[PDB]
């Protein structure tokens, strides 16, 4: 459960997101592809990327940065009362596109880089550890609904 501080901490840096979203979608789609290409072969849409150059082109990967931004903002904004939020994109992870828990622990890394990269005055520690105890609170609701579904492994 995160204190109502600790939500002011992630939301405040995330505002600072929403003023690009796509840009920031971009560069953190390319940092998980990167640190982890397994994740890259998930991707029908992209598996044909072969260089960071490649990837920064693609108006396509770009697209996919904001839904999945645009979703965990909204997630985020719940403050942890997301069940509403969290159902379908875990049943669609878990089900359709394949994808393990240990791929969400690797996006949420990515994503505390890229935060730290483009917002270091509003993403001290006290904000790292707070954004990364909202990206634990999402695993952990999606992997509660893997594991009813099946799939935690
Ligand atoms: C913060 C974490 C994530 C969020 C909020 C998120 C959100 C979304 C949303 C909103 C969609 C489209 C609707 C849907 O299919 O449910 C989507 C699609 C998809 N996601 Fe995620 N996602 C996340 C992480 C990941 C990770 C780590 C992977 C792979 C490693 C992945 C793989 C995919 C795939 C393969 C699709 C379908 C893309 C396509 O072919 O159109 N997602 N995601």
Avoid: C
């Amino acid at each position: 459960v995160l204190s109502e501080g600790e939500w002011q901490l992630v939301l405040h840096v995330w505002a600072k997101v929403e003023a690009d979203v796509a840009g920031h979608g971009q560069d953190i789609l390319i940092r998980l592809f990167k640190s982890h290409p397994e994740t890259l072969e998930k991707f029908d849409r992209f598996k044909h990327l072969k260089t960071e150059a490649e990837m920064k082109a693609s108006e396509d990967l770009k697209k996919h940065g904001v839904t999945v931004l645009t979703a965990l903002g909204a997630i985020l904004k719940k403050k942890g009362h997301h069940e509403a939020e969290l159902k379908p994109l875990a049943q669609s992870h878990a089900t359709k596109h394949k994808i393990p828990i240990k791929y969400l622990e690797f996006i949420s890394e990515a994503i505390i880089h890229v935060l730290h990269s483009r917002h270091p005055g509003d993403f001290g520690a006290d904000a790292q550890g707070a954004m990364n105890k909202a990206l634990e609170l999402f695993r952990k609701d999606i992997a509660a609904k893997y594991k009813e579904l099946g799939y935690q492994g």
